[PDB]
Symmetry: C3
Subunit: 81 residues, 3 copies
């Protein structure tokens, strides 16, 4: 019983039924030193062959993987789904 009230509980309806956003991650492995995430995704980490924990991210999407010898690199990607 009130005009500006109906409008509010009306919102606490839709507001309370939009399902909320969440993180989804996936991995991309590639041969060599470079492994890139798809556009629309951030790189949160890199893994690397030869037990190589030295890596660096290039163009904000690619895992450069940086030791004497490198079979494969890998890029963890995340984003809001």
């Amino acid at each position: 019983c009130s005009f500006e009230s109906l409008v509010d509980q009306r919102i606490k309806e839709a507001l309370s039924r939009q399902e909320p956003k969440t993180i989804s991650c996936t991995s991309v492995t590639s041969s060599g030193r470079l492994a890139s995430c798809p556009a629309g995704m951030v790189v949160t980490g890199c893994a690397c062959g030869y037990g190589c924990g030295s890596w660096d991210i290039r163009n904000g999407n690619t895992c450069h993987c940086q030791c004497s010898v490198m079979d494969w690199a890998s890029a963890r990607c995340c984003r809001m789904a």
Copy 2:
């Protein structure tokens, strides 16, 4: 002043009342070569003993450290909160 408008001033009032969620991360550390984020959390990266930077993710939430010898693993775990 217009039958709509007042409505938008109502949405765009107590909508600025919404408290935006933020990333919250945490680590999980286990002996051997596996470490899992509790479900509801994604895995963003892994760490391994023996300076082992070769890992891979198994079953969407599990850090698998993968060098020959291996004593602990940690998963880095993030969630919206």
Copy 3:
């Protein structure tokens, strides 16, 4: 066409016009064995020199590369933008 609806045709259509939230990430690199994210960011992982997979995160913001000889260290940092 009916006057509970006139309302949500604004609600469920300023939600879509809103400001959809997004992840951003970035690396911080420092000589030594430590590296720190700025405030407002979660650490999603670390890199190390001499190829370390072994690292841990302290005080919620500091990559501690934890091998023995240690060049440099890296943190990966993320926030909602």
